[PDB]
Amino acid sequence: VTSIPTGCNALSGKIMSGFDANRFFTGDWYLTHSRDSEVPVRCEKYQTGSNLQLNFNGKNGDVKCSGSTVSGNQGFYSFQCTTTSGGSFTSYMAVVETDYANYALLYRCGLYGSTTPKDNFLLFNRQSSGEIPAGLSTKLNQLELTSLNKLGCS
């Protein structure tokens, strides 16, 4: 697979310049807000390791993922994930904006077995108590993300 799924937004011209994977894929990231949200809301902690490995506490069990760059779409990563219940899936993401030490705004998209993509904008924070940073105000306006839903972290 050399490009993101048809229907997924490549966000051309809307992604930060100079993204540094070495600084982003380190430590823990809490998923604190999102454009679209489920009920009940939860607090997912994404743990990162070397070579684009990650672990998080998903809807029904731990999820382990392995990432790789997407050759045809600058900034995008493909993650192959497995769940403790025995399931597997693929998901795509790009970092739209981040300061690495506090927050990160991501886009995520996948087909998940369908022909219709399901996507989202995600706000990650280094602290579970993190909320919406002042530095993203204009970017959120531009992307029409004026009302991010707060999830289950505090």
Ligand X SMILES: CCCCC/C=C\C\C=C/C=C/C=C/C[C@@H](O)CCCC(=O)O
Does 112 engage in binding with ligand GSH (CB under 6 A)?
Answer: yes
Cβ neighbourhood burial of 65 (10 Å; 0-12, 13-18, 19+):
buried
- Interacting positions 82-101 with ligand GSH (CB under 6 A): 83, 87, 89
Residues contributing to the site for ligand X (CB under 6 A): 29, 34, 46, 48, 54, 65, 79, 81, 91, 93, 106, 108, 118, 120
Task: Determine the residue with CB nearest ligand X.
Answer: 120
Query: Could you tell which of ligand X, ligand GSH, none binds residue 30, using a CB distance below 5 to 8 A set by kind?
Result: none
Indicate the residue among 14 and 118 with the shorter CB distance to ligand GSH: 118
- Interacting positions 55-84 with ligand GSH (CB under 6 A): 58-59, 63, 83
Compute the least distance from the CB of residue 6 to ligand GSH, in Å.
18
